[PDB]
Design an enzyme around this catalytic site. Structure first.
Site, PDB file in Angstrom:
ATOM      1  N   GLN D 145       0.807  -1.253   0.000  1.00  0.00           N
ATOM      2  CA  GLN D 145       0.000   0.000   0.000  1.00  0.00           C
ATOM      3  C   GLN D 145       0.830   1.289   0.000  1.00  0.00           C
ATOM      4  O   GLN D 145       2.019   1.253   0.360  1.00  0.00           O
ATOM      5  CB  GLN D 145      -0.916   0.052   1.227  1.00  0.00           C
ATOM      6  CG  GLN D 145      -1.919  -1.088   1.321  1.00  0.00           C
ATOM      7  CD  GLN D 145      -2.919  -0.854   2.427  1.00  0.00           C
ATOM      8  OE1 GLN D 145      -3.391  -1.785   3.076  1.00  0.00           O
ATOM      9  NE2 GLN D 145      -3.250   0.406   2.654  1.00  0.00           N
ATOM     10  N   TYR D 331      16.669 -20.433  44.338  1.00  0.00           N
ATOM     11  CA  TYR D 331      16.072 -21.764  44.051  1.00  0.00           C
ATOM     12  C   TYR D 331      16.663 -22.295  42.740  1.00  0.00           C
ATOM     13  O   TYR D 331      17.012 -23.486  42.672  1.00  0.00           O
ATOM     14  CB  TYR D 331      14.545 -21.673  43.987  1.00  0.00           C
ATOM     15  CG  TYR D 331      13.838 -21.799  45.314  1.00  0.00           C
ATOM     16  CD1 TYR D 331      14.111 -22.848  46.174  1.00  0.00           C
ATOM     17  CD2 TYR D 331      12.875 -20.882  45.701  1.00  0.00           C
ATOM     18  CE1 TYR D 331      13.459 -22.975  47.389  1.00  0.00           C
ATOM     19  CE2 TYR D 331      12.212 -20.995  46.911  1.00  0.00           C
ATOM     20  CZ  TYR D 331      12.504 -22.046  47.759  1.00  0.00           C
ATOM     21  OH  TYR D 331      11.855 -22.165  48.953  1.00  0.00           O
ATOM     22  N   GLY D 443       5.404 -27.050  50.509  1.00  0.00           N
ATOM     23  CA  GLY D 443       4.779 -27.770  49.411  1.00  0.00           C
ATOM     24  C   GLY D 443       5.628 -28.284  48.255  1.00  0.00           C
ATOM     25  N   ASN D 479       5.358 -25.503  41.569  1.00  0.00           N
ATOM     26  CA  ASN D 479       6.436 -25.517  42.550  1.00  0.00           C
ATOM     27  C   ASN D 479       7.823 -25.441  41.931  1.00  0.00           C
ATOM     28  O   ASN D 479       8.094 -26.048  40.890  1.00  0.00           O
ATOM     29  CB  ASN D 479       6.315 -26.777  43.410  1.00  0.00           C
ATOM     30  CG  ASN D 479       4.969 -26.877  44.095  1.00  0.00           C
ATOM     31  OD1 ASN D 479       4.214 -27.832  43.880  1.00  0.00           O
ATOM     32  ND2 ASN D 479       4.653 -25.881  44.920  1.00  0.00           N
TER      33      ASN D 479
END
Ligand code: F43
Ligand code: F43
Ligand SMILES: C[C@@H](OP(=O)(O)O)[C@H](NC(=O)CCCCCCS)C(=O)O
Ligand SMILES: O=S(=O)(O)CCS
Ligand SMILES: O=S(=O)(O)CCS
Ligand SMILES: [Cl-]
Ligand SMILES: [K+]
Ligand SMILES: [K+]
Ligand SMILES: [K+]
Ligand SMILES: [K+]
Ligand SMILES: [Mg+2]
Ligand SMILES: [Mg+2]
Ligand SMILES: [Mg+2]
Ligand SMILES: [Mg+2]
Ligand SMILES: [Mg+2]
Ligand SMILES: [Mg+2]
Ligand SMILES: [Mg+2]
Ligand SMILES: [Mg+2]
Ligand SMILES: [Mg+2]
Ligand SMILES: [Mg+2]
Ligand SMILES: [Xe]
Ligand SMILES: [Xe]
Ligand SMILES: [Xe]
Ligand SMILES: [Xe]
Ligand SMILES: [Xe]
Ligand SMILES: [Xe]
Ligand SMILES: [Xe]
Lengths: 442, 248, 547, 547, 56
Positions: D145, D331, D443, D479
């Site tokens: 265009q 972690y 957990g 977890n």
């Protein structure tokens, strides 16, 4: 019958009802009462007419703290509930003689709405009960007061909320025990996405009835999920019977023997004792002052273990009258019994695993909440296949008021309306009677 | 009940901690006020705050289970649920986190026990918690140097000891007195300063720690040497695996 | 004269009534400073990376016509279209980041847990201490554990927590550094409405770091907020660092009293919370802060919302989230450049007030046919009277959205009701399609042909007040040139009424904050500032990079 | 000596074996260069914005112990843990951006439409022309265009499109600038396997701009890619700009031959495609490019995948997308710092090599019991023999993930099967929990107690080969300390076998690309470079902002 | 194989997923039993029948 097991059926009080019933008389696939409870759950809707009227009076529609100034409508919906409810019933029903039920409660403030089964025989799922109920009451309200074309859309917002901009009925003034199908963690989970508090609300905090309804719903989901198919079918039926239906009075008797002074550990010792007496387990070999137990029927040991797990929840959280410790009981009942016996715990450790994260997500910053907001569709508590959530229901049932998010906080509408259904309030009485009545057709 | 397999001192100690018929050795005497002070949920002589009305002032629903399960005193009174939390040094503390939780639910009613690597917790009705806490503090559950009461900032179970053999405490709630050889608790479990410290006695001798500890270590009793204990854990692993497949 | 005449005269050599001009002799892309910059940048990019990139000889040669400058409406700033592409405009990106990274979280359930379950006291002093703790923690810093590693404070300097409440006496006892003062940010009449809506409630406005929002997604916001709320509740109120009651706070913060900017989306357009598609038109109007600074010009308030929505919904959402590439700059710009929509809408406002007076028209179809027809005919006649205007907004879709927005907003000015304004929007499309035998692109009037019938429907997925509708409303979920204009129509009746908010008063207050990076009181001025590369966004990694 | 001895000695004064130290006398946060920088930054930030921020006197006082430096494994770079936080580490952010902004799109269906439906010819000549067009178009530039406004080429310089094919002849026919040459990026045996998997198929590797990915989301990638593929197909193959066949190209590009990095997620964790939760463990292993450079060391290959996955899954996904705040830098660091996991895993490889030889062990429970038990006891014994090591990885969860990862990877080294490796992972947790009467956090072993039973299950939402599992596997969805290690175990058996890929060969080839910003052949080296603030990311807005 | 799951399973089901799920596990188990597929390999039969569910 496919299986050879028979069970003795007991009531909530602890009385024998029917002896030597084929196990499959309790199967969701065969038991007419379970079919009735499941279909009821699918088709029942609570309509909060007072809430609809207050929302319109204030233009507070479309979600929390939402309001459109200048859209207010003053309609006396509660004043005309009978005419509105009757007009809606005519649209909800298929024929005059079908099983449509529309019953006003609280002097017209709430309305128990049970959509006809015919509608679901030609439907793919269950969204028919909320959708048909919503539009029926929207149209009845509009027709009752000749609400204009220009204002009617506010009545729609007051009833069903921000749907369909939101995926859910956000801000709706109707309630069901099932959530919308898009929120299923997986296909066939719909009967698991029922909050524990909804079950405790419907059973009016009845320990054994809450356990039964929860076990009924969970294990029926296991059939829809395909988990209770083939090699695993018997395991799930025995789990339904012994953990949720107080089969052979095992749960009841275990609680009776440990209610005064008992602990999780003492319940374990008596369960291990009962298993030996009933030939479920035998000493497989001995180590230095230690006896390794074995079994020729894991499914039956698991069911005996499922019964003791329930009894331990009732003894432990019962003594505290505080539900929170059920996550601890679900964990260490199974941890302890494995090193007590040398046999795998309930659901082969799935209950222990669910308890680990359940404990974590009910005592940490990261999510979850109190025991009552969990369910079988919750990412935290979906992992055990029916053997954990019924214990959470029993624990919340024994709660004497230690929870901020109790059924009164998150399920008040369910507590008022769904508890009026006899099958939902006392499922154990209906399932047992149905089992007896088909005992010789199985 | 067998409780646990194995032929080491550790295995036996683990069995003893769970066995309600085993009398935990009382190593120190603690006053009721000192327990309330250590807990830090209320002041000594302060009224028990209530989370809900007394059970007798309430009309509980007719429920066979409710009628058969005697509530603990704190639940009858409507006490809050509070906690006591312990950290156990991996350098031969007598109690360990899994040992505690297992033992708690063998010994105590209405117990919400939580197990973590650096902390172990029990929540229950306040007045009942205080009597549990007295036993957990007075008996061989606890050593003033290798164990600590910690409601927060529990770092230390895996850390090296200080020159005195004390476990690390970011908040130093328990102070070893080098002039007297005894340990005093200067602050409460949450870390708030106490007006009068609480004598916690003398730390146990290294030889007594190994006599009473429930942790396996190569420099103590190695888990791998407790072959029968390892064998049961492997058995559980195998039976779990076979049950989950169940198409042999 | 007409508000767009200045812009048109600066765009072209010819007068705006001249129907003829000359093309092809402009030099192609060489006529434009921006295309020249792009061509040179493309050359440097390809050379460095070893792969061709931007190349003006690929495809067709841009610039056979005049490549126009655009005036940002209400400013005197003139820029090329490329400057208003969201990729090239840091103000546009920061506007979305400031929305995406915001969540509203109550403290009422939390304070009830504190007193009922833990049995501790809540006071302005405990709240202030909590608020100082959470403003350390929320950008990513520790309050409890030993050996925690933390976010660099300068990289997350835009993250903080404030509170507001309708109780002036409570508000004055909280350290003012943490308070959005409603009395100071809003005019008296609006402040009284807002404070009455909130009452004794206390609400947090949490903003997580832009760098995190850009690294992750919008669904991160309410979770990030909840973790640090949870840690600060542990710290300030001395509960066990992880006990049963801690879970009540997490459920409160993540579900029970959380208010997302946007709701999640169904699977075909799967997206988490706080994405543009979940932001209902009423929220968007309320996020825009024009209402509290321009409240005596309902046109200005409404069109500031249109600019907010056209950029967000068309350029970023539909033009990138839901498609991508060159995108939809000019679709959105037609609604906030050259003062064209302003001219059309000021005409309608004056028409309504001369004939009805604002809000005084009957709320019925008679008013819809009257106002929407008059404004539609005015707007379309401008394109016929000024060829420069028709050449400026060359896309039928652009003209449809601008003409219908003026018609819709003007109808709502008259009725005071957004739903009749929406009906006027659709009528404008039907008249427009018949006047010029064209409307927009291939699929532009899907919702517009469904439009009339669904304006007042009450059926399941059809009936909804316009304020509650949004980009996920079924008919609206796909196409440019509508959503931002719908947000304007949502604002229009409330702007004419003087309402302090369109749909949610907490959302309105939550962005009446000076600590935001984007100035939501002056959306179009901010867009202009971004175009000129004068806007400084958050979330940059310059501090952790070699240069 | 142990591979971790060096890091331990440079971390503490004492020898690694020593059992006592001294605390409380280090000065708190003043001991650390990074905490000092943070304190000063927080002072400047709070003052500048008028709201308190980072304040070391809030909460508990960090640094009563040694605030440790960390060695990045396989490097000699030592940094404080804060430098490995993803917010402070531009390399980590760019790693995720390079994945998020990547989609694989076939050209096979498209070329069939061209020849069968349009009746035109596709040749290497037309493919090259299309590729030159699409590399102009993909960053956001126009090809059809007039009067199109485009993206600044310098802001989107990282966006491009390459192709690969198993047919060496067709590959040689295409301009090499657009070709990922399988023969040049892979060793001979791997290249032959990969080329046989791809055959005559031709596949595009599309990377959209980092600046867009950061503004929007992962679900943007496949849409953005499809728009510019569609525009370039229109241009290069001279079809009508929007006819019936144009739709076939969009369907093929958006659905029929598209390969997302990640699949969308269910509602509770509602997220679109190409978010971390949707990336299966097998894809992550194949995205990591260690396999094609370190193929003679299966430990190195496996652990580079662990580092890739631990950072992405634990720090960015679980630590921000699914939570937020300080997050879980440590972690994840446990799995790629101080050479600790390397020591444990090289021991297991050696143990398996002495007893079975890699891949020669029976694939049964006997091998699981043997290898996972031996390696678990080795790992835990190191924590007992070295107090420093235990104080280094002070979190039980950290030790669990590291020990079980070595046990799982080792078992898979022996059996050549990832499923028995997974069984070994869970066996390690059960032994670990019993040896020390502790495991991870509250957990941590939800999935680990479900683990054994679900390793070999075949039921609906239980049974799945590990390679197909991912962060959305039910047990795994919540977890830390598992997902990145699972990607390692998934890689473990394939690395021992010499396999060119774990789960998808197209994903493997798609990241063997020297024009990526992040170097996936040396993930851990890249993390170290970001920690030192030496990594230059894409997507910065410096070009369009004031000095 | 054309499979029509019995209507009875749907009278006690909330929606319709019992059809693929009951069919899938039935054929997975039948294949495993037909060839006595081992515990170690059976999970591949599950992937071949139902795909990447439940990761997807
Ligand atoms: C190829 C299509 C088919 C399709 O699906 N989209 C296209 C092209 C697409 C591309 C063009 C980019 C490029 O040039 O390489 C983009 C930018 C979307 C993208 N991929 O980034 C776009 N159009 Ni289109 N497209 C536009 C428009 C238009 C208008 C142009 C009318 C005129 O007379 O010029 C017409 C539709 C209509 O007739 O109503 C139109 C159609 C078309 N549009 C025809 C090409 C028409 C042609 O051959 O020239 N667009 C507009 O109406 C204005 C906004 C403009 C968009 C760019 C922006 O918003 O800045 C762009 C929006
Ligand atoms: C407050 C909680 C409860 C909860 O839901 N999460 C916490 C805290 C949370 C916060 C702590 C931030 C802060 O200090 O302000 C963060 C960083 C998450 C966040 N919100 O950004 C976190 N933990 Ni925690 N958390 C961790 C860990 C741990 C370990 C620490 C054991 C030890 O002896 O130090 C224990 C669990 C266990 O015992 O196994 C733990 C528990 C806890 N963790 C206890 C607080 C314990 C205490 O009173 O000190 N975390 C770890 O085990 C290592 C990784 C570390 C995470 C930070 C990182 O990855 O870098 C952090 C992960
Ligand atoms: C459980 C669930 O939370 P809700 O109960 O839905 O609030 C879920 N969070 C998580 O899984 C948190 C995972 C990351 C933080 C803990 C890592 S151990 C989520 O937000 O969708
Ligand atoms: O050309 S179309 O009408 O398909 C749309 C162009 S944006
Ligand atoms: O203490 S908890 O295990 O809940 C926090 C782990 S990060
Ligand atoms: Cl009964
Ligand atoms: K079992
Ligand atoms: K501090
Ligand atoms: K061009
Ligand atoms: K983003
Ligand atoms: Mg038989
Ligand atoms: Mg009864
Ligand atoms: Mg007994
Ligand atoms: Mg077999
Ligand atoms: Mg001029
Ligand atoms: Mg005229
Ligand atoms: Mg020394
Ligand atoms: Mg040495
Ligand atoms: Mg969600
Ligand atoms: Mg040898
Ligand atoms: Xe039904
Ligand atoms: Xe409806
Ligand atoms: Xe079983
Ligand atoms: Xe409570
Ligand atoms: Xe306003
Ligand atoms: Xe490899
Ligand atoms: Xe299945």
């Amino acid at each position: 019958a496919k299986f050879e097991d028979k069970v003795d059926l007991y009531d909530d009080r602890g009385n024998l009802v029917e002896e030597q019933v084929p196990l499959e008389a309790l199967s969701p696939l065969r038991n007419p009462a379970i079919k009735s409870i499941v279909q009821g759950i699918k088709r029942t809707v609570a309509v909060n007419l007072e809430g609809i009227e207050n929302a319109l009076k204030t233009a507070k529609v479309g979600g929390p703290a939402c309001k459109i100034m200048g859209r207010e409508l003053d309609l006396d919906i509660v004043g005309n509930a009978e005419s509105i409810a009757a007009a809606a019933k005519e649209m909800i029903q298929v024929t005059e003689d079908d099983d449509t039920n529309v019953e006003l409660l609280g002097g017209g403030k709430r309305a128990l709405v049970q959509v006809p089964s015919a509608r679901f025989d030609v439907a793919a799922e269950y969204s028919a009960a909320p959708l048909v109920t919503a539009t029926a009451f929207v149209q009845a309200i509009i027709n009752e007061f000749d609400v204009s074309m220009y204002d009617a859309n506010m009545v729609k917002a007051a009833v069903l909320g921000r749907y369909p901009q939101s995926v859910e009925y956000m801000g709706a003034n109707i309630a069901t025990m099932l959530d919308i199908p898009q929120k299923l963690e997986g296909p066939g989970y719909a009967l698991r996405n029922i909050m524990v508090n909804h079950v405790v609300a419907a059973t009016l905090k009845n320990t054994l009835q809450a356990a039964a309804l929860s076990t009924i719903l969970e294990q029926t989901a296991m059939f829809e999920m395909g988990d209770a198919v083939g090699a695993f079918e018997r395991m799930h039926l025995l789990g339904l019977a012994y953990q949720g239906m107080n089969a052979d009075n095992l749960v009841f008797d275990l609680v009776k023997a440990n209610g005064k002074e008992g602990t999780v550990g003492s319940v374990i010792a008596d369960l291990v004792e009962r298993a030996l007496e009933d030939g479920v387990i035998k000493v497989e070999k001995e180590l230095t002052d230690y006896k390794v137990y074995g079994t020729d029927d894991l499914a039956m040991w698991n069911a005996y273990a499922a019964a003791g797990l329930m009894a331990a929840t009732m003894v432990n959280q019962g003594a505290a009258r505080a539900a929170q410790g059920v996550s601890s009981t679900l964990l260490y009942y199974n941890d302890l019994i494995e090193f007590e016996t040398g046999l795998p715990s309930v659901d082969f450790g799935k209950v222990e695993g669910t308890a680990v994260g359940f404990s974590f997500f009910s005592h940490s910053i990261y999510g979850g909440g109190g025991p009552g907001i969990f369910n079988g569709n919750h990412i935290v508590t979906r992992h055990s296949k029916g053997f954990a959530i019924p214990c959470v229901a029993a624990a919340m049932a024994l709660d004497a008021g230690t929870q901020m998010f109790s059924p009164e906080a998150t399920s008040g509408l369910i507590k008022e309306v769904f508890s009026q259904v006899d099958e939902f309030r006392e499922p154990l009485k209906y399932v047992v009677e149905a089992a007896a009545e088909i005992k010789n057709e199985i | 009940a067998q409780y646990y397999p194995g032929t080491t001192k550790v295995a036996q100690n683990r069995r003893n901690f769970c066995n309600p018929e085993y009398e935990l050795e009382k190593l120190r005497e603690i006053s009721d006020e000192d327990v309330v002070k250590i807990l830090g949920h209320r002041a000594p002589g302060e009224e028990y705050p209530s989370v809900h009305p007394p059970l007798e002032e309430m009309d509980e629903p007719e429920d066979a289970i409710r009628e058969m399960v005697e509530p603990i005193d704190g639940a009858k009174a409507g006490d809050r649920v509070r906690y006591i939390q312990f950290t156990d040094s991996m350098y031969f503390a007598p109690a360990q986190p899994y040992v505690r939780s297992r033992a708690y639910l063998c010994r105590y009613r209405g117990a919400d026990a939580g197990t973590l690597s650096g902390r172990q917790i029990i929540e229950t009705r306040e007045r009942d918690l205080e009597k549990i806490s007295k036993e957990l503090l007075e008996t061989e559950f606890f050593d003033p140097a290798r164990s600590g009461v910690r409601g927060k900032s529990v770092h230390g179970h895996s850390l090296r000891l200080d020159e005195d053999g004390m476990m690390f405490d970011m908040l130093r709630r328990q102070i070893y007195n080098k002039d007297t050889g005894r340990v005093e608790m200067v602050k409460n479990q949450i870390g708030d300063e106490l007006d009068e410290p609480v004598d916690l006695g003398e730390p146990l001798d290294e030889e007594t720690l190994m006599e009473k500890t429930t942790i396996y270590r190569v420099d103590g009793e190695a888990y791998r040497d407790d072959v029968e204990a390892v064998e049961i854990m492997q058995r559980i692993h195998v039976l779990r695996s076979q049950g989950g497949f169940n198409l042999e | 004269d007409k508000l767009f005449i200045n812009a048109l005269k600066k765009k072209f050599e010819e007068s705006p009534e001249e129907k003829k001009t000359t093309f092809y002799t402009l030099g192609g892309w060489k006529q434009s400073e921006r295309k020249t910059e792009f061509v040179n940048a493309g050359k440097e990019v390809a050379a460095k990376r070893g792969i061709p990139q931007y190349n003006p000889d690929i495809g067709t040669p841009l610039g056979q016509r005049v490549l126009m400058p655009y005036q940002v409406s209400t400013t005197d700033t003139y820029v090329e279209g490329d400057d208003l592409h969201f990729v090239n405009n840091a103000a546009m990106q920061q506007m979305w980041d400031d929305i995406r990274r915001t969540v509203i979280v109550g403290l009422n359930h939390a304070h009830a847990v504190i007193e009922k379950r833990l049995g501790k006291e809540v006071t302005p002093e405990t709240i202030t201490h909590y608020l100082e703790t959470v403003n350390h923690a929320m950008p990513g810093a520790a309050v409890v554990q030993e050996h925690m590693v933390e976010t660099h404070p300068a990289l997350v300097a835009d993250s903080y927590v404030k509170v507001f409440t309708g109780n002036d006496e409570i508000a004055d006892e909280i350290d003012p550094a943490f308070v959005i003062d409603i009395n100071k940010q809003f005019p008296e009449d609006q402040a009284e409405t807002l404070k009455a809506e909130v009452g004794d409630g206390i609400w947090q406005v949490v903003r997580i770091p832009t760098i995190v929002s850009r690294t992750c997604d919008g669904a991160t916001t309410s979770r990030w907020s909840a973790m640090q709320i949870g840690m600060s509740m542990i710290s300030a109120y001395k509960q066990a660092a992880g006990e049963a009651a801690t879970g009540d706070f997490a459920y409160a913060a993540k579900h029970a009293e959380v208010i997302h900017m946007g709701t999640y989306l169904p699977v075909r357009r799967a997206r988490g919370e706080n994405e543009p598609g979940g932001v209902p038109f009423g929220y968007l109007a309320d996020i825009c802060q024009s209402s509290r600074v321009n409240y005596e010009d309902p046109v200005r308030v409404s069109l500031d919302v249109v600019a907010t929505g056209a950029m967000l919904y068309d350029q970023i959402w539909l033009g990138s989230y839901m498609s991508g590439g060159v995108g939809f700059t000019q679709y959105a710009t037609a609604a906030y450049t050259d003062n064209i929509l302003d001219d059309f809408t000021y005409f309608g406002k004056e028409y309504v007030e001369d004939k009805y007076g604002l809000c005084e028209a009957p709320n019925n179809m008679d008013t819809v046919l009257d106002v929407a027809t008059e404004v539609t005919f005015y707007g379309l006649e401008q394109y016929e009277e000024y060829p420069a205007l028709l050449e400026d907004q060359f896309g039928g879709s652009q003209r449809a959205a601008v003409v219908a927005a003026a018609a819709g907003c003007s109808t709502a000015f008259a009725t005071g009701n957004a739903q009749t304004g929406l009906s006027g929007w659709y009528l404008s499309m039907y008249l427009h399609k018949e006047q010029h035998s064209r409307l927009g692109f291939y699929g532009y009037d899907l919702q517009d042909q469904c439009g009339a019938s669904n304006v007042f429907s009450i059926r399941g997925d059809e009936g909804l007040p316009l304020e509650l509708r949004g980009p996920n409303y079924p008919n609206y979920a796909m196409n440019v040139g509508h959503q931002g204009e719908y947000a304007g129509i949502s604002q229009a009746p409330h702007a004419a009424r003087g309402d302090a908010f369109v749909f949610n008063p907490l959302v309105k207050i939550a962005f009446a904050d000076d600590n935001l990076v984007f100035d939501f009181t002056n959306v179009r001025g901010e867009f202009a500032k971004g175009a000129l590369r004068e806007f400084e966004p958050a979330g940059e990694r310059a501090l952790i990079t070699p240069a």
